[PDB]
Amino acid sequence: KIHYRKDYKPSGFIINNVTLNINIHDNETIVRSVLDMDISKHNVGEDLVFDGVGLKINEISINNKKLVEGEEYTYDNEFLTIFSKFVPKSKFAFSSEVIIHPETNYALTGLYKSKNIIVSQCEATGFRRITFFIDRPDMMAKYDVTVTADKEKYPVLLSNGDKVNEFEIPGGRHGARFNDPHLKPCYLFAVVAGDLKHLSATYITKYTKKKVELYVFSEEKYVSKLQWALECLKKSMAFDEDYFGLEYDLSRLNLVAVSDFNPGAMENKGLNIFNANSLLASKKNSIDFSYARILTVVGHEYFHNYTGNRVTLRDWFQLTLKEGLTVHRENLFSEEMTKTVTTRLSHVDLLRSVQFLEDSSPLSHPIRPESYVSMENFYTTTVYDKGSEVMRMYLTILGEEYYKKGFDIYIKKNDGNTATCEDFNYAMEQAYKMKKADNSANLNQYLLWFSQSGTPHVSFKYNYDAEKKQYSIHVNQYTKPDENQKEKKPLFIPISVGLINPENGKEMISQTTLELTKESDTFVFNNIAVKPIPSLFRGFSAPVYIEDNLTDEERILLLKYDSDAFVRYNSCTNIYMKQILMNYNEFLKAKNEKLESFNLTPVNAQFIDAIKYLLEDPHADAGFKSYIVSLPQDRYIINFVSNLDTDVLADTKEYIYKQIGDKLNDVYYKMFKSLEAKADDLTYFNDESHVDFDQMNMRTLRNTLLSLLSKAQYPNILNEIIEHSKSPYPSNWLTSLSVSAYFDKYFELYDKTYKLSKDDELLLQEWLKTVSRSDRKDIYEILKKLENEVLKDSKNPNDIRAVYLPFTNNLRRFHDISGKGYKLIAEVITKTDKFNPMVATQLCEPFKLWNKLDTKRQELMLNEMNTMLQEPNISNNLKEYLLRLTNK
Numbered sequence: 001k002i003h004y005r006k007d008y009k010p011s012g013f014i015i016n017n018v019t020l021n022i023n024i025h026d027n028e029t030i031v032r033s034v035l036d037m038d039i040s041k042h043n044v045g046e047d048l049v050f051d052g053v054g055l056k057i058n059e060i061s062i063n064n065k066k067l068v069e070g071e072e073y074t075y076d077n078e079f080l081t082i083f084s085k086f087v088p089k090s091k092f093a094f095s096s097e098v099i100i101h102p103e104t105n106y107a108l109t110g111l112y113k114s115k116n117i118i119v120s121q122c123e124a125t126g127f128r129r130i131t132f133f134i135d136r137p138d139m140m141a142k143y144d145v146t147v148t149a150d151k152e153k154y155p156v157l158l159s160n161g162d163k164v165n166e167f168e169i170p171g172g173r174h175g176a177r178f179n180d181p182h183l184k185p186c187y188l189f190a191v192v193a194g195d196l197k198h199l200s201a202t203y204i205t206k207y208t209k210k211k212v213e214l215y216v217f218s219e220e221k222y223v224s225k226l227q228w229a230l231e232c233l234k235k236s237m238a239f240d241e242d243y244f245g246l247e248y249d250l251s252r253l254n255l256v257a258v259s260d261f262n263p264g265a266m267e268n269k270g271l272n273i274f275n276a277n278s279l280l281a282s283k284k285n286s287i288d289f290s291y292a293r294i295l296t297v298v299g300h301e302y303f304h305n306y307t308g309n310r311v312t313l314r315d316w317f318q319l320t321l322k323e324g325l326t327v328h329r330e331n332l333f334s335e336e337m338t339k340t341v342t343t344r345l346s347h348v349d350l351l352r353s354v355q356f357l358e359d360s361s362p363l364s365h366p367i368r369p370e371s372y373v374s375m376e377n378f379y380t381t382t383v384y385d386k387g388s389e390v391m392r393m394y395l396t397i398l399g400e401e402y403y404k405k406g407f408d409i410y411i412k413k414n415d416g417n418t419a420t421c422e423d424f425n426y427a428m429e430q431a432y433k434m435k436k437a438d439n440s441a442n443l444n445q446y447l448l449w450f451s452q453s454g455t456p457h458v459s460f461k462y463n464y465d466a467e468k469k470q471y472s473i474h475v476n477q478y479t480k481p482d483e484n485q486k487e488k489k490p491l492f493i494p495i496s497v498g499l500i501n502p503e504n505g506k507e508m509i510s511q512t513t514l515e516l517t518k519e520s521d522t523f524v525f526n527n528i529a530v531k532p533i534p535s536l537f538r539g540f541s542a543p544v545y546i547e548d549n550l551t552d553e554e555r556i557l558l559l560k561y562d563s564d565a566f567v568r569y570n571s572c573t574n575i576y577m578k579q580i581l582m583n584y585n586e587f588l589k590a591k592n593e594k595l596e597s598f599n600l601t602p603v604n605a606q607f608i609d610a611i612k613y614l615l616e617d618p619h620a621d622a623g624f625k626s627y628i629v630s631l632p633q634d635r636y637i638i639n640f641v642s643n644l645d646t647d648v649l650a651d652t653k654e655y656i657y658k659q660i661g662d663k664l665n666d667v668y669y670k671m672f673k674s675l676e677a678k679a680d681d682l683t684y685f686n687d688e689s690h691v692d693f694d695q696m697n698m699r700t701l702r703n704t705l706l707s708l709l710s711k712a713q714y715p716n717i718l719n720e721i722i723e724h725s726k727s728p729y730p731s732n733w734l735t736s737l738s739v740s741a742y743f744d745k746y747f748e749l750y751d752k753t754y755k756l757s758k759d760d761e762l763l764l765q766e767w768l769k770t771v772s773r774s775d776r777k778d779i780y781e782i783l784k785k786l787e788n789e790v791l792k793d794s795k796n797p798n799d800i801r802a803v804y805l806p807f808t809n810n811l812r813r814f815h816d817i818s819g820k821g822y823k824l825i826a827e828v829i830t831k832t833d834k835f836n837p838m839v840a841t842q843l844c845e846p847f848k849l850w851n852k853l854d855t856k857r858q859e860l861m862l863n864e865m866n867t868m869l870q871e872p873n874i875s876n877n878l879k880e881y882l883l884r885l886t887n888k
């Protein structure tokens with residue numbers, strides 16, 4: 001059954017209070033539930049229908065009167081229908097006792113066992129797997145939750161909000177009772193039972209001076225990995241205070257790491273639950289990236305407390321309202337915390353590769369979809385990441401002071417309520433009127449960012465009149481029609497711009513934002529003393545394809561002299577893309593025409609010089625440098641190529657890297673050696689409260705250079721690889737594994753890094769990813785080895801994703817023209833779907849680009865997807881996904 005956005009209608013029922021008793025035993029969990037309910041003003045005498053999936057009914061009652069199956073109710077394992085003539089016409093209690101089995105719940109939705117922890121995950125529709133409910137986010141209620149369990153196995157019992165009681169129960173059990181005073185949707189319900197250890201701290205809110213207890217929890221083995229998360233939480237709270245004026249609203253906030261988790265984390269009120277890989281780190285047992293990830297995910301979940309929890313969703317179509325906005329808030333936070341331009345660049349990199357691919361695929365949707373079958377399929381980079389760019393554009397358009405004003409209005413007006421995207425636009429519109437000093441100004445056109453799918457293309461033409469000192473920028477926008485809209489409309493696109501004097505490299509104007517609201521416009525600048533080079537979409541100011549129509553000479557000048565990190569990075573990207581497209585077509589023609597000989601265009605020599613120039617500048621960001629010596633992502637490139645022959649693209653990238661290395665490899669080696677002391681310095685190695693993001697960037701750079709030098713078989717590089725493997729930083733010694741792929745020492749380092757990894761669950765998963773990603777001719781045999789020796793029969797999403805996903809990025813081998821990469825992943829998807837549909841769909845990622853490949857590869861991918869579609873008992877989740885991806 002399809003849900004349509006336009007069909008939204010309030011429930012004919014109200015649920016005011018939920019009182020739960022959750023009694024956990026080894027071989028069953030019993031859930032007793034009383035809902036204090038009422039008839040809404042929208043009620044039209046309908047049956048009372050509860051969602052309830054996979055529940056075993058012991059009893060149901062209305063008002064102390066037992067209801068009888070086949071007489072008063074029916075239940076079909078998805079819906080409990082109570083016939084209207086038995087439903088009261090005023091306030092009443094509904095109560096039920098059901099049996100569930102977390103110990104056999106491998107889908108990790110509802111209540112499940114993760115190792116030795118019992119934990120819930122209810123977003124989006126998991127609560128119906130715990131007990132009967134009207135399981136939709138506009139049914140808000142207050143929760144009174146008792147959990148009971150064996151004391152010895154489950155000494156720590158948690159649910160949302162204030163703990164009001166703990167008590168002994170005969171038989172060696174105990175119970176804990178919680179009251180959450182805040183109205184919430186059921187998706188924000190959580191419970192946890194485990195032998196948990198913690199770190200804690202106290203935080204005093206900035207304005208009202210509330211004392212808040214902060215606890216972070218994990219299994220005993222990993223308690224020493226909790227400290228950075230606790231520091232990140234404090235940073236998050238301070239930031240929401242300082243930037244947004246927002247204070248936490250409960251006496252206690254708990255974060256809990258679990259080993260088996262589908263998402264990254266979950267913002268349950270007062271009880272945030274994390275994938276361990278996004279909560280736990282230590283410097284001896286985690287890669288550098290873990291520290292940024294944890295800062296990101298802790299901040300994200302914390303910021304949900306307002307954007308998601310205190311203001312929640314009217315319906316699931318509004319998902320981007322909490323996810324887009326929360327990602328945006330986390331981006332501001334992370335950028336402020338890390339103080340490196342690579343934070344913003346990394347987000348742009350992900351948008352323009354993964355999200356752009358999505359937006360040009362058959363899966364393309366607007367950030368607010370018009371329909372769904374399974375909401376699970378819309379936790380997408382479109383909803384999260386394009387969402388965040390749409391939320392960011394408000395700040396770009398309004399500026400900080402007015403943005404904060406509009407956000408305040410949003411919070412003030414909707415606090416304690418459900419909300420829609422229109423509510424957020426309305427608030428921003430008020431700030432807009434205030435800023436334009438004009439009560440007739442409006443953001444009606446802005447709404448198109450929510451409803452219209454596809455990436456806009458913004459293109460540029462220029463005129464300089466030297467006599468008048470007058471510069472003109474003519475801008476055009478175009479969105480390609482697709483299955484969502486036959487006719488696309490012009491968006492409100494803010495374009496942040498500067499102008500660079502190419503003669504001296506200086507800024508010629510104060511940075512300004514051009515507001516393009518039409519299909520095209522011409523913006524004219526007076527008193528421009530020399531012909532400038534434009535610096536366009538600074539900070540990446542809108543989520544668009546940029547066609548700068550600049551020469552490579554001009555891009556090089558921007559790369560060298562522009563102040564904006566994005567424009568420099570993008571100028572580099574465009575130079576690479578021109579070269580890739582040229583060399584790709586040259587190889588392609590030679591192949592197609594079976595030429596005995598042909599020419600390749602060399603890489604621009606002034607560009608190579610500019611790379612040298614930047615690398616040798618010790619004041620330039622090391623993270624930025626690592627971007628400039630790397631070609632654009634395959635998934636970014638594919639947006640510019642029809643009928644992509646992956647082997648030809650692989651040859652193209654190889655040729656380009658070789659041409660650059662022939663000039664730069666000695667410089668690369670020099671830098672690798674000179675960066676070492678600063679990069680690998682052990683300051684803070686024992687301090688999980690301090691992270692030097694600049695130093696981490698230096699390590700990234702060194703590892704990037706080592707990778708380039710290894711691929712090139714630079715003289716005696718193996719010696720440096722071996723030495724690198726003895727570093728205390730896992731980022732280094734895991735790099736040494738993957739760069740050794742090109743040498744006979746690979747399996748030696750394979751074994752060594754395994755032994756270093758095998759005793760830490762999360763580090764082992766990093767090791768798995770490193771092997772999966774290894775550039776090996778025998779990679780298929782290696783995957784089999786991983787299957788038989790390490791992964792075996794694991795149902796842990798982290799393990800499965802670690803083994804297979806990174807491999808699918810192997811341009812040469814995953815896309816083997818035999819189709820054996822496709823067949824391998826399809827088999828895994830089908831196997832996984834039998835116990836965890838959510839993860840099965842995630843594993844489909846590689847197929848998203850099927851219709852962009854050459855005809856043979858298209859056919860092979862299509863064959864595998866149609867095969868998956870034919871599997872008996874295929875989940876709704878996977879079926880919906882694959883039917884959409886294959887155009888029906």
Ligand SMILES: NC(=[NH2+])NCCC[C@H](N)C(=O)O
Nearest residue numbers: 123124263265266267376379
């Ligand atoms: N169906 C899902 N994938 N749910 C994941 C929920 C993640 C959580 N709402 C967050 O983004 O912080």
Ligand SMILES: [Mg+2]
Nearest residue numbers: 054055100101
């Ligand atoms: Mg069941």
Ligand SMILES: [Zn+2]
Nearest residue numbers: 300322323326
């Ligand atoms: Zn979120």
